[PDB]
Every structure is written in C-alpha cells, then in structure tokens.
Nucleic acid binder design. Structure first.
Ligand SMILES: [Mg+2]
Ligand SMILES: [Mg+2]
Ligand SMILES: [Mg+2]
Ligand SMILES: [Mg+2]
Ligand SMILES: [Mg+2]
Ligand SMILES: [Mg+2]
Ligand SMILES: [Mg+2]
Ligand SMILES: [Mg+2]
Ligand SMILES: [Mg+2]
Ligand SMILES: [Mg+2]
Ligand SMILES: [Mg+2]
Ligand SMILES: [Mg+2]
Ligand SMILES: [Mg+2]
Ligand SMILES: [Mg+2]
Ligand SMILES: [Mg+2]
Ligand SMILES: [Mg+2]
Ligand SMILES: [Mg+2]
Ligand SMILES: [Mg+2]
Ligand SMILES: [Mg+2]
Lengths: 149, 129, 172, 144, 257, 146
RNA sequence: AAAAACCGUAAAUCCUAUCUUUUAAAGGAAGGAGAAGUCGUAACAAGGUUUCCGUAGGUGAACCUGCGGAAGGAUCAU
RNA sequence: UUCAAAGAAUCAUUCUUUUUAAAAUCCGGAUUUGUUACUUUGAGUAAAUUAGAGUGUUCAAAGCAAACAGUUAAAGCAUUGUGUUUGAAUACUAUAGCAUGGAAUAACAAAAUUGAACAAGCU
RNA sequence: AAGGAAUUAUAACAAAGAAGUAACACGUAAAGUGUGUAUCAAUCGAGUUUCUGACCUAUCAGCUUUUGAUGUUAGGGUAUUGGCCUAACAUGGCUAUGACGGGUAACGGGGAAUUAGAGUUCGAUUCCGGAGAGGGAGCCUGAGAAAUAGCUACCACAUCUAAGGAAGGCAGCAGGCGCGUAAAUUACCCAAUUCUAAAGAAGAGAGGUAGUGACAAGAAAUA
C-alpha cells in the first residue's frame, strides 16, 4: 500500500478466456447504449462497470465490446474533465478540510489530509503528464471544493 | 518493488538448487530471462522448462539437474568493452576453465567466450558456475 | 584592453593572471569631426596602417537608385542612433545621417537627361526631389571614418529616408 | 540491499559520500587538514635545529621507573619550545646548556614514544657532531 | 618578449626524423618553406642521417656551400631547408638523383632514380584560386603555385609537374579506383587503389583504400596523395611497393634471411 | 512594427533598388523555415536571414528561457563517466544561443544549434532547427540524454 | 622641440571598512599527566535505595529526588 | 512489439549459407526502413617515459645502433668503376569530439471527448 | 570555380585610394646570383574560439546588475570576432548537477611512485603549454614585446659621487650573504647538438667537457 503499512492483496483477477463466453447474448451496440444511459444517470466508470456486472448479464465490457468503458464514454463524449480516482481523492480532501475547519484539534485527520493531498499531487502530476488534466491545474485547498462538480 | 525480474528469478533458482528441489517456479517470465535460461540449458546446467503463458507476465517452471553451484545477476549492467572482459571474468567466476559470464551484446545474449570469439563486448547480465 | 578584467557570467571575479598583451590593444577613439581634412596614420599590427580621420568634409557619396557616386563637402550632421552627444559635437561615424552639399548629383542628372550605365525609368522620389530643390540632402555615412579615413556615404532613400525624417520630427 | 546505491547513473552519490566520509579516517584527516603546518613544531619537516634552553629530567610512565633525560630546546626555524629526549647511556652531559642541537622525530610521527610522557623528539646532533658518534666515542669527540 | 620559436628540441623533434635522445640537445628546425615541418624533413637530416655523406652539420653546410645539391632542380644553400614528400634531389658531383618517398614505416627514404624520370615530380593540388583576369591557379603540397592550370583539375587531384620548366604534363583525377599513396597516420607508406570515399558534410572526408593484399584501411582524404591510375603508378615506388605487412608477417620475412 | 530601434533596421545583403528580400541556406541539411523566406523581420545574427555562417559544432539542447531579446538558453544534459565508480552521473551546461524570430520557441522545446562566431559575451551559437516537444515540470529539471 | 589643457590607461601614498591570519592579557573555566594527598562510596553482586534514559529542581563531591520511559533486570512463567 | 525455421562442414558441440512478413526504390528479378546511450571497427593524435620487436654496450643499467665478407680479393651489380644487407617496428595518446558495423540491453520519440492511408472529385 | 553553407574567388559599373613595379651590389651559368619590392598562396606561427575534462570546504547559499552583470540596437575600437568600450533600450544571467565565496604548504599536462585487479599519492623539476623577471603600472621599436642583461614613472631595496648628479635589477652562468633539515666550480671549450649574422670561417655560461657528488641507477674485488 502506497501510504499505510497495509500489505493486503485483495483483488479482482480476470479469467483466462478473454473472448466473451458463449452464454453472453447481448450485442455490443445494446451494451454501449446501456453504458451511456448509466453514465447519464450520474454513475462513474467503476460504478457503471459494477452495475453492468450485476444488474445486466455481462462480466467485462472489454470482452463484449473491443473497447474499455472509459474509452467508450470518451467516444460518446460524456467523459468527465476530471478523472474518476482523482476526483474521488479531491472529494475526500475537501471533506477532510471541512472537518479541520470545524474541528481544529484533530491531529490524525490533519496527518491523513496531508497524505491525501500528496496522493492527489502524484495522481494530478500523472494526469498532467498525459493530457487528461490541463497543465494549468495545480489543485488548491481554497478552490478544491468548487472543482469536484 | 520488482526492478530486475531477472535477478529475482536467478536468486530463486539458486535457492532451489541449494535446497535440492527439481522443479522451481520462476514467477515473472521475461524475454531476457527466457534467453538466459536457454543459454544455461545449452551449456547443460538446466533441464527443460515450461514457460506457462497466463494472460500476463508468464510464469516459468524450470527443471533442474542438480548441477548449478551458483547462478547470479551482476546488477549495474556495466557496459563492458572487449578488452575489459578478462579482468571482470577473473574477478567473478571461479576458474578460467569453467563457469560462464553472460553478456547482453548487440548480437544477442552470449557468454564471455562467445563474445571474445565474435569481437563485441556489451552489457554484463550475470553468471553461473 | 580588448581583454578579460570582467565578471564571469555567473558573476564571479576572474582573478587576473596576465598583464595586457599588446595584441589586446584598445587604442582610443578618434572623434572625427567636420572641418578641413586632417588625418593621422596609426600603425596597426603587421605594419597595417589605418587612417584616423580626425577632421573631414569631402566624402564620397553614392546615389543608390542610379548606383553612382560623387565627392561633396558635408555641411552638417543631423542624427546619430548611437547618441545625440555625437551629433551635437558634429562627429562623423559609420551610421551618421548627414547633409550633403547636393548640387553635384543634380548637375550629373542634368548632364545625363532632363533637369531634376543608364537604367533610368526609376526617375526619383518626391521627398528627395524636394530636398534637392533646397540644394542639400540627407545621407548616411557608410565608411568608418575613424578606421578608413574617408567619410564615404550614400543618399538616404524612400522608406529609410521617411523613417529618418520621422525621427528628426521638430514637433516640440 | 547493500547500503550503497548501485545504480548505473549513481556515481555522484557514490563519490560524494566517499568525499565526506574520508574525513572520518584519522590518518587521512592528519594528512589533509591545514592545521598540520600551523600546529607542529617542525612545520612539516624531518628535523629541526634548536638551541638548548634547559637540560631536564622527565619521570617515566607508572609501571616503569626511570627519570629520562630530556632537553627543552627552542627551534630556530619556528621559535617553538619542545622537549627532546636525548639517547645514550650518558649523553645528556655530552651536550652543553646552550648548544645548537639538531632534533628529529622519535619514530611515531607526532605520537609520543614508549615510557616517555609527551616528548615527541629525539636530539640527534650537537654542534654538528653526531650524538650516536659521541656515544660510540671511538668515532668522534665533541668539538668546541 | 614572446614571438615565434627558433629552436627545436631533439625529443620534441618529429619521430620520423629518427634523431637520438643522446647525440645532441636540439634538432634542426626546418626553415619555413614549401612544407609543413611535421611532414617535411630538413636537408641536414638527409645529408647526415639518411645518406650519411656528412658526419656533422658543419660538413653538410660545407657541401651546401658548393652549389651542388639541387632540390626540384634549383639550388639550395640553406642547411635546414625542408625537402618534403615527393621532391627530387639532384646531388650533382656523384650524379645521383634521389626522390624522397615514404617507407612502409613513417620514415623518409631517398629512393634513387633515373635521369629521365627525375625531370618530373608529382604534386597534389590543394586549393584552386581564381585570381585577377579570371585566371585559375592551383596550389600544390609543394607550396608552389601553378598558374593557368588545365580547368579539369579539381581540388584533391595530383599533377605531374615538370621541373626544367614550371609547366605541367598531365593530371590524375581523384577517382574511385585511382592508385594512391598515403602521407600521415598509421597507414603512411601504404599504397592502394581506393574502394570508397565517404564525403561527410561538415567533417573530414574519410576514404577507404584497398591494398594489393586486399587489406582495406581507411584514411582522411586530407593526407592521401594520388599516384596513378588503377594499373600503373606514375612514379617508381620503393622496394616494398607500399605493402605494409602485418607484424607477424614482417617478423617471418626477417627470419627468412 | 519592424523598425523599433533608433537606427533603421535594413538587412545587409538585401539589394533594394536594382536586381531581378535576402536569406541563405546555412547547410548541413537545415531547411530554411518559411518565416525567414517570407515574413519580414531584420536580424543581423539570424543564421538564415543575417550574415553569420554556422560552422563548427552542432549540438542539440532544450530551451530553458525565452526571456532575452531574440536569444535563448539551452541546457545540454549529459553523462560524465567516473572511472573509479565505473558509473555515470547527470551533468549539464547552459549554452546561450541566439534565436532569430523565424523560430517561435516556448520553454522545454528541443533545439539544435550550430556554432558561429562570438555574437556576444557568451552567445556563440544559434538555433537552426527547433523540434516542438512538451514539458510538465520545469525545463530546468528535465533530463533528456541526447 | 619645450610647455600647457582635456578625455583614457593609471602607478603610488594616505584615510576609512570589511575580511583573513598569526599573536598578547588580569582573571575565568575546561581538559590530559603525574604524584601510595583530602573527603566520602557513586558504579560493578538485588553493589547493600536494581540499573540506565530523557527532562526539571536540588546538593561539598561522587550524586539525590520528581515525572514519563527502557531491560542493557534480579521476572521469557498462573 | 520478428519469435523462429531449414541445409553443409567439425569433434552432444563449433563456424558458415539460405528464407519468413510490409513499404519505398531499380530493369517477374534486385536493393533502403525511428533517435541517443551502449558496443565494434576505424580515422586523427609529439616524442621522452610505459609496455614492447630487433640488436652479445664484455654483461647489465644502457643506447639506437648494427651485422656481413677480406693480411686487404673474391662474389655480387655497373657500363676500369662500385662495398652489401639493413634497423631505428608495434601498441599505448581520455571519461569527451570525429566517422563507423550493430540484431541484445537501456532510454526517448512516435501513438484516440478522436489519428493518418489511399482512390475519386473541386479549387 | 569552389565550399555543408557566401555579402567567397571572381566580373562589371560609379567614386576615392595607400604602397609599390630596381636612380642598388656582385661576377657569375652552361644566359647567373645577391639585396629590395605590390598582391596572392604556402610556411614558421600567433590571437581569439567550440565542446569535454580539476583538488579540499556548505562552520561559504544565495550570487551577479549605479562601477557592463545578461541580452538587443547603433556605433567606437581592434589585425578580426566579441560589453572589448560608448550611447540608447530591455531585465536578464548563474545556482543544491554546489553558483558565490574560502583554502590549497596548486602552475597545467605529457608523466612519477606504488598497485593482482581496482585504485591512492605525487608531478618545482629532461618535452608541450601558461605565467613572471623586486612590486605594480605605462609606453617606444619592431613582423612579432605591453620586452625587462629596452625605455618612463611610482613604491620597496640598494651602488658610486668632488654632493652638483649618475646607474641599478642573477627566477641566465658561475659565485657570495641570508634563510634554513635541505643542495656543486667565480673551471675548460665552441669540438659535438643547435641558433643568430652581412650565414663554412664569427659569436653563443644556449649547448657541451671536466670538477664537487654514497640523490638515484647499473656491473663488480676483498680470493
Ligand atoms: Mg512511499
Ligand atoms: Mg505485495
Ligand atoms: Mg614577459
Ligand atoms: Mg531491595
Ligand atoms: Mg556503591
Ligand atoms: Mg545501587
Ligand atoms: Mg532537599
Ligand atoms: Mg533532594
Ligand atoms: Mg551603457
Ligand atoms: Mg603556488
Ligand atoms: Mg610539472
Ligand atoms: Mg612552491
Ligand atoms: Mg630576486
Ligand atoms: Mg616589463
Ligand atoms: Mg640579469
Ligand atoms: Mg624595475
Ligand atoms: Mg646563480
Ligand atoms: Mg643533499
Ligand atoms: Mg658549431
């Protein structure tokens, strides 16, 4: 684990066969449409994937549709400006900051806030290095709260 | 974390040899590692090995002939010129008569003797006795 | 004097370890002026003499349009993109705009064709013509009189001329 | 892990640590600090000439029991006062209370030698005659 | 004060003089002249260390005083006059004619030569100036200006040049298969055919020169001297004929004697 | 505005009146840009438009600055081998280069510069070809072996 | 030609200032060495208050005491 | 991210030859294809020192000389005259720069809220 | 007609324009030479200049910029480039990959010692380069000097003087005092090696030869 002393290995691990299984009836177009609908309804990539797995009969959008789900969202144009994980981190940070504002003496929270900030800065940096974030994007503790939306 | 797959693999192999195993599961296969294994096989130290393809970094399992004394990486893959080889080999491997000092060389990976025969030295991966 | 004795770009003092080697010669400026001609000879390196004009007048001036030249007294200095001090002191240098006694060119023109080898067809500017009408015309110097020892120059033309006029502009 | 970095492009760290650490080596420090020239009577030299100021006894380290015969001398070079042990069975009297003595180290760079407490110097010539020669006596006799 | 250096120290002397370390403190310091000191050789050395006609500098000087040694057919009384790569020496009293050439080592030999062939000398052009009256002048490695040279002569090629009269006979272009001698590094004596020229953009134009043992060696174009067309050399080469043998081979040869 | 100085910025080697604007080729396969051939701007020390011939070394760098007028800084990053440790170490050197406004160069852009005469107290180089490139930290910190 | 004036190189001298480097000094306060000197007994054993840590106050001196730590404890243990 | 495959020689191994895709070039045949590190060949460097070849300075340290034939001529080669063979090698001259063969190992560059390849048409 | 690249060679036109092209001296060679002379090229070089490469110190972390620090323009100057200098305008430049200071009992390198291999130390000192001629500074001559057995000046030493003036610079060779742990003859010669000259024939403390020399190095008595 990047920050704790946590060393767990709980993980999804996908099956050997990566051409979709026989029982999968859904044609790709339908699944794409479903994905789009889910996106519209406010769900994030991971969440969307989960929904697809559970509510509909489909293991992996990658086996049914050549593309992964983020890619298809992008194609359809409903991709977030601000990437999933990063966004989540930002939200968490914001929450922490609110708590701090409320409740000044919380040392552990402060420590954890610092850690989350650091992680954001890593993630943020990575995104900048690609082209998902713009280069003009620092993350600010003052702004942050407004950013998430 | 991993850094040099190959080094780790070699260490594992060495450990197996020490215990006196027979089989041994080299856990991330790598083209380079495969090449190294092949080379070893060629010079007799290793038996068969069944590079098992997952759908990821593969696993090798490798069949041992109880024959290796040590095998190793020499990290910092020092560039090594053809004249500079001899001293290095003296430093490393136990006798001039045997052991092999494996270079990656622009003519694929091969041992010090092979390199000498060719003419090109290159970067030095590892060795066995 | 052409040499070191200067900070190191990082702004570190070059601790000097060398006198001044004569081939780093920085002999002092000939502030060459108007007047009757007077030029000294300074003996540069391999007996390469060079001619420190110190007073001048009768430089060779060219007329670029027609690609000809004539020797004229130069009657005043009027601009110096280096500094106004030089112009105040009436000092000739390699980009001084000065005023030529410009009858010669006019005379030449008259001799050749009309009145104010031959690729004529261009046939003069308006501004230049106007200037000529008063007798006296603006012209760059192009020699480096301090080296060469001659105030050779050329008549300022069209766009450049206009620019110089603007620069000169009077106004307040 | 080794402790040290063994990267291919690691050289800066490797050099730099060594450069800093060298100074922990006592011998190296002795060699390369500038206080050698300052804080040393001989001032980086094999011997030195000093006129004598005082013939003096020095009581030995506790286990052994002797009064070792030293000579407190002033270096002409440096204006430094130093005790120099004089060898020989009876070689204190071979020198005068004011004699131009030529004094060497004792054998251990600065570090003091044997029974003697803090006498780091061995007179080895008096009035240009060799102390050893005088001791032998068959060779020479002190000129004055 | 500080200006040019008049002396040459005997160890700082260029190796192919083959001077002693002992036998002197200084060396002769070639006069300025038609050759570059590092690839020339003064007349003193020729007279004293090569032919051994003289024992001393004094003797050489004496010899020179009799106006009997000609270098390119006009006399020289300057003991330290530089002779250089291709130049014919005509010692008049013996009626000996030498031509300076290189050995298969770096060393100058005086070759010995006939009256007939003596009358010309090869000269490689370096620069080809235009001068007043649009007349072109070549400039040879002999530091000599050939005026009104035949237009087809280009910057690197050699020219067979007469001595009795300043005019030229024939010229040999720098071709892909042109018999060549070398005059600088490692492969100095070497004589080959040329395989290939590189013609690098900003840099030195490196060329590859196949020998008559078919041993290819490279060299800067700078220091290559055209000597023939693929068939025959236009000069008499030394006994070895520019065939720089291997070391082992040389040793074997030595043994077999 | 082209004429910004107290003097008239002319272009030596132009030839205005007679004949059938001036630029040259600079050689070593460095293509004269459109902006030099077209597009007025006078520069005494442009490789292409001006009177400086590039000759000697050519070395790629990576721009650190545009702050000077028509003049750029480029850090060369390289590896100094140290034989004791038989290892390398990142080292660098900031070559100032003259630019010429044919090349619009923001920081972190790779350039190649030819030598040329001493143009100022330190600028002995001018930029012949500007690759684009993109940078995210500071150009200061980007190592690009080259 | 001397002489003079003005820029410009600019020695040298003096005045500061700063820095570096040796170097004096009443006294102060350490250190090391020595001598079978005075006063205790601190430590080593449960060393006769286990020891030791950090910190604070104390006290002729070793040291004592408080607070929280440690076992390098005299307990691997209900 | 092109892995491999087959044939001939030698004492299971060594060294060699041939082909297995795609694009551009040349009269169905034949021949170019990221950058740098790295490596290989070179090139270019003063010698003295160093390693090193030759050479009985009486040895050796040396030095860069020498050897050979003869109580005085033969022999050679020159058209009576002319000694002859030679040697003073080679390698070292960075860590940078120069060119260079390169298949491995490294980097980096190229690459989808969309990127370029052709065939047709219009300017 | 080149060069990778030209405002290059070159050619023409319009203007200026140095210096020169023998008012010289031998008597030679198979008609020649010496001396001099414009430009070009070569050469002996030199200056600048690119890249890369150095020891100790962070108890030196911020430096550089009115005093050019970084750049642009125009000039001046130079043999030529260049803040090299001037003027005008920008606000740059270097830096934790150690800038800027400090130290070095530091000239650099070729190399030396010692190492199996790495390395560590040394390199005043045979060669190359730099610098300096008591200390700074300034000039003249000349192709080349910011020369020092050239000159001017000041400072610091110091010699002769009839007291008015005058000359002087061993980090050339010897030699002397001093300092010092610490180091040779006021020798002979131009014979060799070289240089300079009006150039065999003269000079040369350059250089060589001896003298002193247990610095080192080699061989080798005392049977
Ligand atoms: Mg971590
Ligand atoms: Mg894990
Ligand atoms: Mg001087
Ligand atoms: Mg108790
Ligand atoms: Mg007690
Ligand atoms: Mg107790
Ligand atoms: Mg109390
Ligand atoms: Mg108490
Ligand atoms: Mg200014
Ligand atoms: Mg010093
Ligand atoms: Mg030295
Ligand atoms: Mg000293
Ligand atoms: Mg003195
Ligand atoms: Mg002087
Ligand atoms: Mg003197
Ligand atoms: Mg003086
Ligand atoms: Mg002396
Ligand atoms: Mg001595
Ligand atoms: Mg003589």
């Amino acid at each position: 684990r990047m920050y704790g002393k946590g060393k767990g290995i709980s993980s999804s691990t996908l099956p050997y066969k990566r051409k979709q299984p026989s029982w999968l009836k859904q044609k790709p177009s339908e699944i794409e449409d479903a994905i789009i609908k889910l996106a519209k309804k406010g769900q994030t990539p991971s969440q969307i994937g989960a929904t697809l797995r559970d509510n509909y009969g489909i293991p992996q959008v990658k086996s049914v549709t050549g593309n992964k789900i983020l890619r298809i969202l992008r194609a359809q144009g409903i991709a977030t400006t601000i990437p999933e994980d990063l966004y989540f981190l930002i939200k968490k940070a914001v929450s922490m900051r609110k708590h701090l504002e409320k409740n000044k003496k919380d040392k552990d929270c402060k420590f954890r806030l610092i850690l989350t900030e650091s992680k954001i800065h890593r993630i943020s940096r990575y995104y900048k290095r690609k082209k998902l974030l713009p280069s003009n994007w620092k993350y600010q503790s003052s702004t942050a709260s407004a950013l998430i939306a | 974390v991993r850094m040099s797959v190959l080094a780790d693999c070699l260490k594992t192999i060495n450990n197996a040899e020490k215990r006196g195993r027979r089989q041994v599961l080299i856990r991330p296969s790598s083209k380079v590692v495969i090449k190294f294994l092949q080379y070893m096989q060629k010079k007799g130290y290793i038996g068969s090995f069944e590079i098992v393809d997952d759908h990821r970094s593969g696993k090798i399992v490798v069949n041992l002939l109880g024959r290796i004394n040590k095998c190793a990486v020499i990290s910092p893959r020092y560039d090594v010129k053809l004249d500079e080889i001899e001293k290095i080999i003296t430093s490393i491997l136990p006798s001039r008569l045997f052991g092999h000092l494996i270079l990656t060389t622009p003519y694929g990976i091969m041992d010090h003797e092979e390199a000498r025969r060719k003419h090109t030295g290159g970067k030095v991966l590892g060795f066995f006795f | 004097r052409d040499g070191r004795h200067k900070l190191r770009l990082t702004g570190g003092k070059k601790k000097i370890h060398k006198k001044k080697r004569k081939y780093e010669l920085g002999r002092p400026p000939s502030n060459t002026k108007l007047g009757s001609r007077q030029v000294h000879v300074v003996r540069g390196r391999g007996r390469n003499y060079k001619y420190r004009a110190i007073k001048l007048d009768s430089g060779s001036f060219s007329w670029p349009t027609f690609g000809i030249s004539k020797n004229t007294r130069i009657i005043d200095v009027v601009y110096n993109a280096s500094n106004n001090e030089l112009v105040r002191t009436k000092t000739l240098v390699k980009n001084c705009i000065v005023v030529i006694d410009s009858h010669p060119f006019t005379t030449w023109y008259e001799n050749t064709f009309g009145t104010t080898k031959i690729g004529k067809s261009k046939n003069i500017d308006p501004l230049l013509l106007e200037q000529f009408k008063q007798g006296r015309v603006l012209a760059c110097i192009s020699s480096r009189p301090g080296q060469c020892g001659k105030a050779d120059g050329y008549i300022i033309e069209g766009d450049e001329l206009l620019f110089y006029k603007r620069k000169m502009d009077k106004r307040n | 892990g080794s402790g040290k970095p063994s990267g291919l492009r690691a050289a800066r760290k490797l050099r730099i640590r060594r450069r800093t650490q060298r100074w922990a080596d006592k011998s190296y420090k002795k060699s390369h600090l500038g206080t050698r020239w300052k804080s040393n009577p001989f001032r980086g030299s094999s011997h030195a000439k000093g006129i004598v100021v005082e013939k003096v006894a020095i009581e030995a380290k506790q286990p052994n029991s002797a009064y070792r015969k030293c000579v407190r001398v002033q270096l002409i070079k440096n204006g430094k006062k130093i005790t120099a042990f004089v060898p020989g069975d009876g070689c204190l009297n071979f020198i005068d209370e004011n004699d131009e003595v030529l004094v060497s180290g004792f054998g251990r760079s600065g570090h003091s030698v044997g029974d003697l407490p803090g006498v780091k110097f061995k007179v080895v010539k008096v009035a240009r005659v060799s102390l050893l020669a005088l001791f032998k006596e068959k060779k020479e006799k002190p000129r004055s | 004060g500080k200006g040019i250096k008049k002396h040459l120290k005997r160890v700082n002397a260029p190796s192919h003089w083959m001077l002693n370390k002992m036998g002197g403190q200084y060396a002769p310091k070639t006069s300025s002249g038609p050759h570059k000191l590092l690839e020339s050789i003064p007349l003193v050395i020729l007279l004293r260390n090569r032919l051994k006609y003289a024992l001393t500098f004094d003797e050489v000087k004496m010899i020179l005083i009799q106006k009997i040694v000609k270098v390119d057919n006009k006399v020289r009384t300057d003991c330290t006059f530089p002779v250089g790569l291709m130049d014919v020496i005509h010692i008049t009293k013996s009626n000996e004619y030498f031509r300076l050439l290189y050995d298969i080592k770096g060393r100058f030999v005086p070759h010995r030569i006939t009256n007939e062939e003596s009358k010309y000398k090869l000269c490689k052009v370096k620069k080809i100036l235009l001068r007043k009256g649009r007349l072109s002048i070549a400039v040879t490695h002999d530091g000599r200006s050939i005026p009104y040279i035949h237009p087809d002569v280009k910057v690197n090629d050699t020219v067979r040049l007469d001595l009795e009269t300043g005019k030229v006979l024939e010229h040999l272009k720098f071709q892909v298969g042109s018999l060549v001698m070398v005059t600088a590094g490692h492969s100095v004596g070497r004589v080959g055919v040329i395989s290939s020229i590189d013609k690098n953009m900003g840099t030195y134009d490196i060329i590859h020169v196949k020998d008559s043992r078919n041993k290819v060696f490279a060299t800067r174009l700078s220091n290559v001297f055209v000597i023939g067309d693929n068939t025959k050399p236009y000069i008499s080469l030394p006994r070895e004929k520019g065939i720089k043998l291997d070391i082992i081979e040389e040793r074997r040869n030595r043994l077999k004697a | 505005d082209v004429q910004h100085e107290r003097a008239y910025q002319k272009q030596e080697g132009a030839s205005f009146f007679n004949s059938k604007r001036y630029w040259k080729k600079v050689g070593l396969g460095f293509a004269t840009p459109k902006e030099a051939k077209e597009g007025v701007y006078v520069d005494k020390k442009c490789p292409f438009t001006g009177n400086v011939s590039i000759r000697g070394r050519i070395l790629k760098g990576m721009v650190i600055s545009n702050k000077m007028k028509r003049t750029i800084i480029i850090r060369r990053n390289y590896l100094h081998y140290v034989k004791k440790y038989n290892r390398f170490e990142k080292r660098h050197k900031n070559i100032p280069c003259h630019c010429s406004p044919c090349f619009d160069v923001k920081e972190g852009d790779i350039v190649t510069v030819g030598q040329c005469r001493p143009l100022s107290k330190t600028v002995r180089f001018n930029v012949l070809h500007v690759e684009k490139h993109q940078i995210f930290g500071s150009a200061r910190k980007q190592f690009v072996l080259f």
